[PDB]
Design a protein around this ligand. Structure first.
Ligand SMILES: CC[C@H](C)[C@H](NC(=O)[C@H]1CCCCN1C)C(=O)N(CCCCC(C)C)[C@H](C[C@@H](O)c1nc(C(=O)N[C@@H](Cc2ccc(F)cc2)C[C@H](C)C(=O)O)cs1)C(C)C
Ligand SMILES: Nc1nc2c(ncn2[C@@H]2O[C@H](COP(=O)(O)OP(=O)(O)OP(=O)(O)O)[C@@H](O)[C@H]2O)c(=O)[nH]1
Ligand SMILES: Nc1ncnc2c1ncn2[C@@H]1O[C@H](COP(=O)(O)OP(=O)(O)CP(=O)(O)O)[C@@H](O)[C@H]1O
Ligand SMILES: Nc1nc2c(ncn2[C@@H]2O[C@H](COP(=O)(O)OP(=O)(O)O)[C@@H](O)[C@H]2O)c(=O)[nH]1
Ligand SMILES: [Ca+2]
Ligand SMILES: [Mg+2]
Ligand SMILES: [Mg+2]
Lengths: 338, 428, 53, 437
């Protein structure tokens, strides 16, 4: 009998993990404050990592990587990308971004901005969206919190019928050994109202969340296109595949990001172990170049896929460490010699 | 020398007390004349905890034998180890107490108590650094319950800064048919809540059921019961009698076992359970000792440990075994059954290992638990008490010695408060 | 990067190496505290003997 | 030459004390007699070893040490053991009845009645000192005497020697060898009371040492003998600079200067390598690069924590054996590029380095193998606040129910000293977080 503790009630993903674990009949749930657990399904914020791995006769495992917040906050991601030699500063797959504090790299932002003016090229940025610098600087200074001025992609790949925007969500599981596992099913979160070049005020064709989309669901069920259909659209419409045109770039970006922080976050020679599920958010431009938008440290799955992914998390993340009485993941590894 | 002064009162007290001295004398290589004949210096390092040392290299138990009748103490004097005790430490009347707590506490026992205290004073003054006192007695009779608690109260007055320890035998209708035992027990428990630091609840119900069900003795005697009491008594005092790390004295035991002053009633356990003679040829493994010592069927208090939570636990293993394996097995018990150990006292189980096993065994384990399940024992007494007391049944035997009903109401109250106090911490 | 403050001797040597640059109670009070504790302790003991009386 | 007085309080302090002077005597060539053949100035001197050892006309070398416990048993073993003739009887101070794992009993009840005798005996050592620099205090956090008496002593020593430095070697409680459930209470109490009076404190978590003994020395179930002989090595690496010719950490003031910018944040992390089983048949000798890289592994630290998720404010490397500066600097360069070593913005990212050519001495028939080179890293990092969090958590769990509190209140202490002690630690945890992110 193994033991666990649930410390985030809001997690749709780890509610399903605990449910699935209990169903096995070899995992008992304890109450949050009981320290004698094998597994912590931890809280979102202020997770007490200092208290893990100090219970004798218990191997302890947690569902977050301490320090992974550096990848999962927007201003930390820019700084991480900008200051790590393995990515920076000529990273081809992350939009030109600047960390901006309210009332810093604003002096450095305006410099590159004012060459896009005299260069006579498309000068739209995101924080939200505008082509004039005055609106954005004056917006954040007013707003409150720290923000990022990031280059907006004027030329996104558009789905037909409908001339619409989208973004790709890929779920990634990093186990206790730092094996990087990309789930084979991803999802496109679509706009359902045509993308407009000149019209930036109306921010529903431009911002492709699942919530802000509220016509809705004209083309696909809940504005969620999945990989079989999107592969078929790419074959029929563009004479290419998902794997070739998009999924290699996604694999490269995921593996680059996670190898960059491995020294800072790995639990290889530690007294407790970590795993974590990330959600990477990707944008695809009209040239089929993939761009990283952000990484989410506490993702939610899409309704269809919950059952499979959560069983995967149990199989490779939890049952690897705590064994009981066809693979949904692609393992991301590359060792090129030079 | 950190000296403990032992007192035994009444039939039960003197009978289990006599047997305690037999067992520990054999463990320390002391024979009936008080001469050392052992083959190990570990036996003598802390001998002064229980024995004074006279001239001729003689060891005398620091033991005071008290009773209001002469029968049980003539039986002890005439017994095999009887010649070991100091003769002036036998203090006894002729009247008896008639299984009446009022007679023991207020009338018959009052007449004799100052001559007991004179012997206690003499033994105490002779101590370089006295730890305190341990009393053996039953709570169901008259002398041990009534006079025994009177003694506790007087000793506390003279020695307010010493530890008071009891082995209190609880009455069961499976062993005794005296109708007024719940009265004597409830009055005595009222005293124990106020004036003791540590009480071992040796429950006759548990001792009987162990002997009948587990040991397969269809007609148990007191001797069969007492054999389990002496094993337990040998076990729980091991840390006081040999070197030397965990719970090595009475105050250190109390600071580990007693998170709140009133909740100082302990539930002892033992493995392996044995009957006299009937031979343990097979030594237990470390995993079996650990499973058995925590088993309900091995508790000397008739309480279901799964019905409560452990506040604190002391586990003491005896014999030559793997310390690594003891540590694994102990951690295993608290990790597999973690919800029965209060989360709000971290690391509440402590473990000792002594290299010398008890007579006739290679491996033993002794459990001492402060569980909230002990409320079931007090609740059983309370129900037996209230049944009679709501009709004032048999109360004339007590009011005829000058007691008022109000004493009964107060004692009833304090014990019901104890019960609700245990339930308070069971639900935190 | 930069070694400084190098001292050598027969027993050993020491130095500093820089990779990057930057960017009580009185004796009385103790006794008032120890005596107040003793007085509280003695009050508790006196109350006990009051109750036992 | 400036003298240092070592004070050993409680069982842990005394027993760690024995292992230390044993090890010093071996390192310096002093016999259990007290006789040092290699010392040529008979009847006195001012060599570096005279910081720790005074001298008599008969050529005897006597530790500048006081052992104090409220209980004769363990100090009686010092009186009658191998090193009995090394110590003058007035250095070994014993009570009768101990503090029963109760801070309040050690501090208030039994502390009050013994404090003046201990100071008298410490005063007798300070009087035979030409220039006393201060004190090294050894004690547990968990015992009553170790927690309670030490904190009182430290308050007194401040009064009687305000200008003198005080260093601690403190044993942090671990359930695998603890003897009391109230050690978290005792630890927070003594930490609160001692915080102002200690210039630099080296915490050793018994959990870390116990695991190092299992993992690297292949010991099934470590005893205090196993733990202390390892502790004494770490202590010796730290005090070697005061007892031997050198220019790094030559006096007690430098420990503070080099390791403690913020006075309250005075708990440097000690990491030691290599730890190699004597019974190990064949062993590849580890390089300067390897032992220096082992200093950034949580598994080798005296307190298990993660310096990657904190900031350094100072970092000394103390080598013993066949080591030259060329190898140390090359090792640092490599290490820096592979590891996460953030300093605070207001300190230079850098390392103070000290090398002694004599390799570590081992106790004959011990568990530790002889090695060609060893290192103790002393780094002040915010990651050690993890140890306060763990301890503060256990305190909170018990204190919310007022469990065992009646034992302390019974000895004179007020329930409010608990919450004061606690909220001082709350502020300490908050100081470390302020510096660390
Ligand atoms: C015919 C009555 C028998 C003797 C009694 N049964 C009952 O009381 C039943 C009957 C009806 C309802 C339920 N009750 C409990 C009974 O078996 N008793 C206790 C009552 C004795 C009270 C009176 C009659 C004297 C058992 C004890 C009884 O058998 C005795 N044991 C001993 C005894 O242990 N004697 C030893 C010495 C000794 C004497 C007195 C003591 F207090 C202790 C030890 C020596 C023997 C050889 C030994 O070691 O086994 C003496 S009497 C209990 C365990 C239930
Ligand atoms: N490393 C090490 N720890 C010890 C030693 N002795 C005790 N301890 C630890 O110290 C704590 C107990 O404190 P002790 O020093 O025994 O207690 P004390 O200071 O003698 O205080 P009292 O006995 O209460 O008067 C526990 O955490 C023990 O694990 C030792 O020799 N070495
Ligand atoms: N540089 C950019 N170019 C084009 N579109 C962008 C963009 N940055 C953000 N977006 C749009 O904004 C949407 C959400 O962006 P982002 O993920 O940064 O916000 P968010 O973090 O509040 C949503 P979530 O955390 O749930 O994924 C994306 O779906 C994308 O269409
Ligand atoms: N276990 C055990 N119980 C006993 C013994 N003798 C008496 N009792 C119990 O003690 C109670 C009566 O107390 P007793 O000691 O005989 O009366 P006292 O002489 O007035 O103290 C009854 O519940 C008996 O069952 C004994 O030797 N062993
Ligand atoms: Ca000299
Ligand atoms: Mg009788
Ligand atoms: Mg002690």
């Amino acid at each position: 009998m193994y033991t666990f503790v649930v410390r985030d009630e809001n997690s749709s993903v780890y509610a399903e993990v605990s449910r699935l674990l209990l169903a096995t009949g070899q995992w008992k749930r304890l109450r949050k404050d009981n320290p004698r657990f094998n597994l912590m399904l931890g809280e979102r914020n202020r997770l007490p990592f200092g208290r893990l791995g100090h219970e004798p006769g218990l191997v302890q495992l947690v569902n977050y990587y301490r320090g992974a917040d550096k990848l999962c906050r927007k201003a930390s991601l820019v700084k991480l990308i900008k200051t790590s030699p393995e990515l920076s500063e000529s990273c081809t797959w992350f939009p030109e971004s600047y960390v901006i504090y309210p009332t810093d790299e604003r002096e450095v932002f305006l410099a590159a901005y004012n060459r896009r003016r005299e260069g006579r090229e498309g000068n739209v940025w995101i924080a939200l969206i505008s082509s004039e610098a005055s609106e954005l600087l004056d917006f954040i200074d007013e707003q409150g919190q720290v923000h990022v001025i990031q280059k907006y992609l004027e030329k996104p790949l558009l789905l037909e019928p409908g001339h619409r925007k989208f973004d790709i969500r890929s779920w990634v599981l990093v186990d206790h050994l730092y094996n990087i596992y990309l789930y084979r099913e991803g999802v496109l979160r679509t706009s359902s109202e045509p993308y407009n070049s000149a019209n930036f005020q109306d921010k529903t064709c431009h911002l492709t969340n699942h919530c802000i989309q509220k016509n809705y669901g004209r083309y696909e069920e809940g504005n969620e296109m999945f990989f079989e259909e999107f592969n078929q659209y790419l074959m029929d419409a563009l004479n290419t595949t998902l794997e070739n045109s998009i999924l290699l770039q996604i694999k490269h970006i995921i593996r680059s990001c996670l190898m960059c922080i491995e020294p800072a976050i790995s639990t290889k020679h530690l007294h407790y172990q970590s795993f974590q599920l990330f959600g990477f958010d990707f944008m695809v431009d009209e040239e089929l170049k993939v761009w990283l938008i952000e990484v989410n440290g506490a993702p939610a799955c899409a309704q269809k896929l919950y059952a499979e992914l959560c069983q995967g998390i149990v199989d490779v993340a939890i049952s690897s460490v705590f064994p009981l009485a066809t693979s949904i993941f692609i393992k991301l590894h590359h060792h090129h010699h030079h | 020398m950190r000296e403990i002064v032992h007192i035994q009162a009444g039939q039960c007290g003197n009978q289990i007390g006599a047997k305690f001295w037999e067992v520990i004398s054999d463990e320390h290589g002391i024979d009936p004349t008080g001469s050392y004949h052992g083959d190990s210096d570990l036996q003598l390092e802390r001998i002064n905890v229980y024995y004074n040392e006279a001239t001729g290299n003689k060891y005398v138990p620091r033991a005071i034998l008290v009773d209001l009748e002469p029968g049980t103490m003539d039986s002890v004097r005439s017994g095999p180890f009887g010649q070991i005790f100091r003769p002036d430490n036998f203090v006894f009347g002729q009247s008896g107490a008639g299984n009446n707590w009022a007679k023991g506490h207020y009338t018959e026992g009052a007449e004799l108590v100052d001559s007991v205290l004179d012997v206690v004073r003499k033994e105490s003054e002779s101590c370089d650094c006295l730890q305190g006192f341990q009393l053996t007695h039953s709570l169901g009779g008259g002398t041990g319950s009534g006079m025994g608690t009177l003694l506790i109260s007087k000793i506390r007055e003279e020695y307010p800064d010493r530890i008071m320890n009891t082995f209190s035998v609880m009455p069961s209708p499976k062993v005794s048919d005296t109708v007024v035992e719940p009265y004597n027990a409830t009055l005595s428990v009222h005293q124990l809540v106020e004036n003791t630091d540590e009480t071992y609840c040796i429950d006759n119900e548990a001792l009987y059921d162990i002997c009948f069900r587990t040991l397969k003795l269809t007609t148990p005697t007191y001797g069969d019961l007492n054999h389990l009491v002496s094993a337990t008594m040998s076990g729980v005092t091991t840390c006081l009698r040999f070197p030397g790390q965990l719970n090595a004295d009475l105050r250190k035991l109390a600071v580990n076992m007693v998170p709140f002053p009133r909740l100082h009633f302990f539930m002892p356990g033992f493995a392996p359970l044995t009957s006299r003679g009937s031979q343990q040829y097979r030594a237990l493994t470390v995993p079996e000792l650990t499973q058995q010592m925590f088993d309900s069927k091995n508790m000397m208090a008739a309480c279901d440990p799964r019905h409560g939570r452990y506040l604190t636990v002391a586990a003491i293993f005896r014999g030559r075994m793997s310390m690594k394996e003891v540590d694994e097995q102990m951690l295993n018990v608290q990790n597999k059954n973690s919800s029965y150990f209060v989360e709000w006292i971290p690391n509440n189980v402590k473990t000792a290992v002594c290299d010398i096993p008890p007579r006739g065994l290679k491996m033993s384990a002794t459990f001492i638990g402060n569980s909230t399940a002990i409320q079931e024992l007090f609740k059983r007494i309370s129900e037996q008490f209230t049944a009679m007391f709501r009709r004032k049944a048999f109360l004339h035997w007590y009011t005829g010695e000058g007691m008022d009903e109000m004493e009964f109401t107060e004692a009833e109250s304090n014990m019901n408060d104890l019960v609700s106090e245990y339930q308070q911490y069971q639900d935190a | 990067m930069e070694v400084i403050e190098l001292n050598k001797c027969t027993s050993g040597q020491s130095f500093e190496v820089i990779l990057k640059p930057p960017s009580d109670p009185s004796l009385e009070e103790i006794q008032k505290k120890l005596e107040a504790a003793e007085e509280r302790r003695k009050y508790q003991e006196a109350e006990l003997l009051k109750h036992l009386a | 030459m400036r003298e240092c007085i070592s004070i050993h309080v409680g069982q842990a302090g005394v027993q760690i004390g024995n292992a230390c002077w044993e090890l010093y005597c071996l390192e310096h060539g002093i016999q259990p007699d007290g006789q040092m053949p290699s010392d040529k100035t008979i009847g006195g001197g001012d060599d570096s070893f005279n910081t720790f050892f005074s001298e008599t006309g008969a050529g005897k070398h006597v530790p500048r040490a006081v052992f104090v416990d409220l209980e004769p048993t363990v100090i009686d073993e010092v009186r009658t053991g191998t090193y009995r003739q090394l110590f003058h009887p007035e250095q070994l101070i014993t009570g009768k009845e101990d503090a029963a794992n109760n801070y309040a009993r050690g501090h208030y009840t039994i502390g009050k009645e013994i404090i003046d005798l201990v100071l008298d005996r410490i005063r007798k050592l300070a009087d035979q000192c030409t220039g006393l620099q201060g004190f090294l205090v050894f004690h547990s956090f968990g015992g009553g005497t170790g927690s309670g008496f030490t904190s009182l002593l430290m308050e007194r020593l401040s009064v009687d020697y305000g200008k003198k430095s005080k260093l601690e070697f403190s044993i942090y409680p671990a359930p695998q060898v603890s003897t009391a459930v109230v050690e978290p209470y005792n630890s927070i109490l003594t930490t609160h009371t001692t915080l102002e009076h200690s210039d630099c404190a080296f915490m050793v978590d018994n959990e870390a040492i116990y695991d190092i003994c299992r993992r690297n020395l292949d010991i099934e179930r470590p005893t205090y003998t196993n733990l202390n002989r390892l502790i004494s090595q770490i202590v010796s690496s730290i005090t070697a600079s005061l007892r031997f010719d050198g220019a790094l950490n030559v006096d007690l003031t430098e420990f503070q200067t080099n390791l403690v910018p913020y006075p309250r944040i005075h708990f440097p992390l000690a990491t030691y390598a290599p730890v190699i089983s004597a019974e190990k048949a064949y062993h590849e000798q580890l390089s300067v690069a390897e032992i220096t890289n082992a200093c950034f592994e949580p598994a080798n630290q005296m307190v298990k924590c993660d310096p990657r998720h904190g900031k350094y404010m100072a970092c000394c490397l103390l080598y013993r054996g066949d080591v030259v500066p060329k190898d140390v600097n090359a090792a640092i360069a490599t290490i820096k590029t592979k590891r996460s070593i953030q300093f605070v913005d207001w300190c230079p990212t850098g390392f103070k380095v000290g090398i002694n050519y004599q390799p570590p001495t081992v106790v004959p028939g011990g568990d530790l193998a002889k090695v060609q080179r060893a290192v103790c890293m002393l780094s002040n990092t915010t990651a050690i606040a993890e140890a306060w969090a763990r301890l503060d958590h256990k305190f909170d769990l018990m204190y919310a129910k007022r469990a065992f509190v009646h034992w302390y209140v019974g000895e004179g202490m007020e329930e409010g000293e608990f919450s004061e002690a606690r909220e001082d630690m709350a502020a300490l945890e908050k100081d470390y977080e302020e510096v660390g992110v």
